[PDB]
Design a protein around this ligand. Structure first.
Ligand SMILES: CCCCCCCCCCCCC/C=C/[C@H](O)[C@H](N)CO
Ligand SMILES: CCCCCCCCCCCCC/C=C/[C@H](O)[C@H](N)CO
Lengths: 245, 48, 297, 97, 297, 245, 49, 245
């Protein structure tokens, strides 16, 4: 009654038979912007089912020596489908999200993934190691796209913040012994009712294996991690010609 | 189209290849119209 | 109008934010109720699942035999205003006689509280903070001596002309707020409102402020939030000639009416740059101290 | 429900029985393609093995949503996730997941 | 739910089609009322503006001095069923003894009413037509003589197996409707319903039936509407041996329960192909007759 | 009170000071598909303001020897903006239109344009002149795109139908002496509640100068004709990957 | 596995609209399907055979 | 609550811990013949518990290359116990059935059995391969007895009917991953209120492995399939001397 679940939105349906309940980010469901909070005067467009659907963006292979990966939102969808088209044609952006991470193994595999959502996850550079060099992460690292990016130092999350305290953010654990999926529902987290879907990344999703994957030789060595996500209550405003980046 | 979402994961001591059986049917709003002749005639010569 | 069912019954426009939780008053710590030995099957408070991502709700009574304790310990001092409304150093201005930094008798200090780790670690605990500010300016010579010198502190909002010299026309302060105090007087103290264009200051801005290609020359724009650029602080020695005394000015900030959102993990690495989460890549140190073995203390 | 001959590649008598089911196995985890088939019930192809398709062969016009259920016949210890996508008319065969 | 004003007050979902006009009964032509000389300024019925795109509404009374005429002329014969419910030739099937067209004693006639201009010009006046059909099959030898020959008319819906020979297994007609008549009998007459998948037949389909590149080989697919492919008509001489008499079969169609939409300009050029609006490019002739000069009749 | 008009829809506004009233195609305003007429079961998307706006697609130059031009709908917008993106991503299509043709001249210019909307305007070929050749118009002629296409024989409209009877369709006249704009509002005209926005062209717009343009030498010789149009009550259904043609 | 056809509906899988289905099921009935004359036997009466 | 079941009838009890519900053939429980349907005038005998009991008739070994087996009813019991004695001594016959197929394996075995009940399952011959030979199946094939018979061409079920459409009959699936038993309750299926229990076979039970059995070497290679069945509401009429065939 809590291990089996089915999430349907738009024209896509995601099922699961070994779920571990659903986390609502900060105990708040996604909702449309209230008229007392909106600041733009133009009437926003609400395409509804054409954008509020589960997008399966990429598949990452979990290995015994993996460090972890992170994705930026809504960067991952800035170039995907009708949602990406609307985000390119419209200046303003507002939506929630429903992130479903899939990672399935057998009863003889072991390992634990920490799936967390960190708002305004600003990536820092290693500052040339010693710290005397004022470097900045490249565009391909600050906005990795749909491929995500592999963490270099997951202990500090490449941002000087320990991962041991990452659980203060909305998070779920994919421990292969019990559950093979993590569901996090994240409302719009920003200091503004609307923001640019290209320049600003509202939050970053982190998938870091805390307990290394292990299995005896002979079992299936390819354990993929697949990210599936669906915007919720998406709004757009400030239409103009399309902008690619 | 059927795509592998993540993988087919199996432990040591179990078959590496598994088969899927597909069953097809129609929903309760399914209707048919314009009854026509059969597309296949199961007969070659005269049925003796 | 609306005639189709998918529009009539549509939930589009429901702007109420369904909140699964509601704030409840808690002036003191929770009381501990009497518990007794409990030997039953099927029901188990001890076994939980951190897998879900929720903190375990097991209580003292459900694990061990407890007594009745009326907890009267107040939780007032852990509130946001109690934790943050303590003045701390946020900026230092040096006004030397002969030097290369500010030999002109004036100095422009871009307002930012990220220059000192003591304040930065506290403020950086939350992603969004909305508060008022109270700034106190303690000025003295490098020997700690007070001298009869008259100074002018000018608040220069973003877009206002930045003074370029001690006798610049910008010092006429016909519109900008200015404070004229002497070092013999008590430190100047003013209250600053919440001036951000956004509804709350954001210490971390995971984005860029302008469109276009972000090349090497246009690479310092990452992490810079224009909604936090509250302006520049201009200080000068009020006079036409050079001041007789060298001055060092320390600016202490104390937040009040504080509101905070989105807690994040506290920093555990040495800070390197203002408005930049960069850390020493080769010198990543553990959050806590270490020990020789796990089986010994 | 009737068995849908999705894997209708074989033609020889000794292996006509394997047309009823199609295999899955451990893969490289890149979202590869497993099987495709058209959704037309009265059209020549996989749907001819179904009673629904055989009956729709007797009727020129059909209207209504169809339902397809896939039964996994693997071992109890074998797990995995598969994505089954229906492409509305007009779009070609998807190149990738 | 709906909490924002732009959603609450939104007209999205209003499926009612606002119609500025409503049909009014008109069994007879409009009466003419008495009119008198009218000499006034400012108000002018004679001057109109065809610029707007609306037909001028000036009446007889508003232009000349008219009498009172009670018009009892009925408008019944100009209705759709009165205009269209007259049988006319739509297809002809030839069944020769020795020939190259159908020497096998059978012929498959793809059902289409565009093969004869008399019917085509009438039906092509409207873009969309929804009607029932009544088909009469007049069969005779080329000399107009009736002969004791037994024929079979089979209706082959789209997708049904097309017969390939006079003794083909498809003639068992276990599901298809078939008519067995002799030439000595009166012509066979059956009623055919509205079998299109669309809500109405469309004589002009400005589009393609399938996606992909429309090259030279895939170029005949333009203008072909699958929603009008009602099937094939199969006729054969009922026997194993060749028929003694040559036969020509004429199929007459008569619409009934006709509904029409979207009138279009009537054709004014010679027809060239079935299901194709192609016209002789070099032989474009004027719609009407010509005269030597405009100032003379 | 009838010569000045302003049409506003979406985020675009079109004004006119020499209008000649507004023609509603067949006396019927565009409306959403009723639940008793819809046949698709998926919930359609109604992007509203992001697609229901005035698009200025191209400008044609009227000359003393011009034959006329025609455009196909919604072909002209299959590759324009958020409307084109939605038409590419969605199989089904339903919308009305509001076509505003602009053609402005001076009080010393003369000429008359016939602006008409002909549903299912099937273009035929010249059949090799004599009529013995079974030709078909090329793709660039049956689906001209946003550039339209110049009629070869406007008397038969390249389809064997006289233009003298074209006024039976919703039409307006741009006679330069009085009006410089023609406004036609066309509801969805099809035998189906929904249809493909790429394969099927619901109607074609014809702009044919019946009275040739004339002016004494010295006046402005460039008299442009600009087509501006706005979909009304647009619906889309059957989302899949984008299809370019 | 049970041997019963899956009862999942359109509404329980994808976001659907409200469609009033008026398509008649009369033509799929037994009499409509079977009450069409078809060949069942042929008798040959030759002169010499 | 649906996986564990216990069937008790007569003096026999069958239990199961991995059941997959119970299929009632055509949604109709076995019942005695009504007085408005009976045609014989003699009072039928209803031995009740002496015949309505679970008979375990034979055990078949499932192999990786097995084609399938079928049994004929009530042929399988014409020579078993008091039921067989009554069927031999009485001309008329009427009963329902409750067929319980047992096939148990481990969690590392895989395979799927299709257990179906096909009324009036007439077995045809291969007609000499080409089809020019008018053969008939032997007595040992049309009435195999309690040993059943192995199908030669399970695709056509040795009767020219595809097995892909066999699921239209009352059926259950024994997929070793979930369930190890199939329960089908079949009422009396005939055009007559009574019939001969020797000459006429009311229905045939088919057990055909659709997905071949598989397992890694080392596991138990003998996977038996055992058929257990119990007549329900059995009636007999027309007593005379016993008839063996
Ligand atoms: C006498 C006038 C003093 C005016 C004081 C204005 C202070 C306003 C309070 C907030 C100041 C911004 C603090 C720093 C914000 C961000 O961390 C940085 N801008 C990072 O870019
Ligand atoms: C004895 C059986 C006779 C069956 C008669 C069926 C006739 C159905 C009436 C409409 C037939 C279609 C008429 C032609 C339509 C279009 O103009 C062409 N298909 C153009 O492609």
């Amino acid at each position: 009654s809590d291990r089996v679940a089915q999430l349907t939105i738009g024209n896509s349906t995601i099922t699961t038979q070994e779920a571990a309940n659903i986390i609502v980010g900060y105990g708040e469901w996604p909702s449309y912007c209230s008229d007392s909070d909106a600041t733009a005067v133009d009437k926003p467009t609400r395409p509804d089912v054409s954008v509020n659907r589960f997008y399966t963006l990429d598949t990452k292979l979990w290995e015994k020596s993996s460090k972890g990966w992170y994705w930026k939102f809504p960067d991952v969808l800035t170039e995907t489908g009708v949602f990406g088209q609307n985000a390119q044609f419209h200046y303003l952006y507002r939506s929630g999200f429903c992130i479903h991470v899939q990672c399935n193994a057998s009863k003889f595999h072991q390992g634990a993934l920490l799936v967390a959502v960190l708002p305004e996850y600003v990536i820092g550079s290693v500052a040339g190691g010693t710290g005397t060099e004022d470097t900045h992460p490249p565009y391909k690292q600050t906005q990795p796209g749909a491929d995500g990016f592999e963490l270099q130092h997951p202990y500090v999350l490449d941002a000087g913040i320990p991962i041991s305290q990452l659980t203060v953010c909305p998070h779920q654990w994919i421990n292969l012994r019990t559950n093979n999926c993590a569901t996090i529902i994240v409302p719009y987290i920003n200091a503004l009712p609307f923001d640019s879907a290209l320049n600003h990344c509202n939050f970053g999703l982190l998938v870091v294996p805390i307990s290394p994957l292990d299995y005896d030789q002979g079992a299936t060595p390819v354990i993929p991690i697949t990210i599936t996500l669906a915007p919720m209550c998406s709004e757009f405003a400030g239409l103009r010609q399309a902008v690619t980046q | 189209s059927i795509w592998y979402q993540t993988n087919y994961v199996v432990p040591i001591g179990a078959p590496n290849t598994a088969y899927i059986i597909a069953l097809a049917a129609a929903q309760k709003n399914f209707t048919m119209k314009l009854c026509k002749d059969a597309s296949d005639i199961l007969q070659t010569g005269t049925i003796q | 109008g609306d005639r189709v069912a998918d529009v009539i019954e549509s939930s589009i426009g429901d702007s109420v934010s369904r909140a699964l939780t509601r704030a409840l008053p808690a002036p003191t710590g929770q009381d501990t109720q009497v518990s007794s030995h409990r030997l039953d099957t099927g029901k188990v408070p001890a076994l939980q699942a951190a897998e879900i991502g929720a903190s375990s709700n097991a209580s003292d009574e459900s694990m061990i035999e407890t007594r009745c304790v009326l907890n009267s310990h107040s939780t007032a001092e852990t509130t946001l205003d109690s934790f943050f409304s303590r003045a701390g150093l946020v900026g230092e201005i040096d006004l030397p006689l002969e030097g290369t930094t500010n030999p002109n008798g004036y100095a422009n200090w871009d307002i930012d509280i990220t220059g000192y780790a003591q304040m930065r670690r506290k403020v950086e605990l939350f992603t969004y903070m909305r508060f008022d500010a109270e700034f106190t300016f303690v000025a003295c010579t490098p020997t700690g001596q007070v001298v009869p010198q008259l100074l002018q502190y000018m608040f220069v909002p973003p877009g206002a002309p930045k003074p370029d010299s001690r006798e610049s026309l910008a010092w006429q302060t016909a519109t900008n707020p200015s404070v004229f105090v002497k070092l013999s007087d008590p430190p100047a103290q003013v209250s600053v409102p919440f001036m951000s264009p956004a509804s709350a200051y954001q210490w971390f801005y995971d984005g860029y402020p302008t469109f276009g290609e972000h090349k090497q020359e246009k690479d310092l724009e990452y992490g810079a939030c224009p909604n936090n650029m509250m302006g520049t602080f201009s200080v000068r020695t009020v006079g036409t000639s050079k001041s007789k005394y060298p001055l060092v000015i320390r600016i202490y900030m104390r937040m009040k009416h504080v509101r905070a959102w989105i807690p994040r993990p506290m920093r555990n690495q040495n800070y390197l740059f203002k408005a930049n989460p960069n850390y020493a890549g080769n010198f990543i140190k553990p959050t806590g101290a270490s020990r020789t073995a796990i089986t010994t203390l | 429900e009737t068995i849908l001959e999705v894997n209708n590649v074989p033609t020889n008598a000794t292996s006509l029985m394997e047309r009823l089911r199609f295999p899955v196995s451990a893969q490289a985890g890149k979202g590869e393609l497993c099987a495709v088939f058209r959704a037309d019930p009265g059209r020549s192809g996989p749907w001819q093995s179904t009673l629904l398709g055989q009956l729709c062969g007797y009727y020129t016009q059909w209207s209504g949503s169809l339902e397809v259920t896939f039964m996994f016949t693997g071992s109890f210890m074998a797990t995995g996730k598969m994505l089954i996508a229906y492409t509305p008319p007009g779009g070609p065969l998807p190149k990738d997941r």
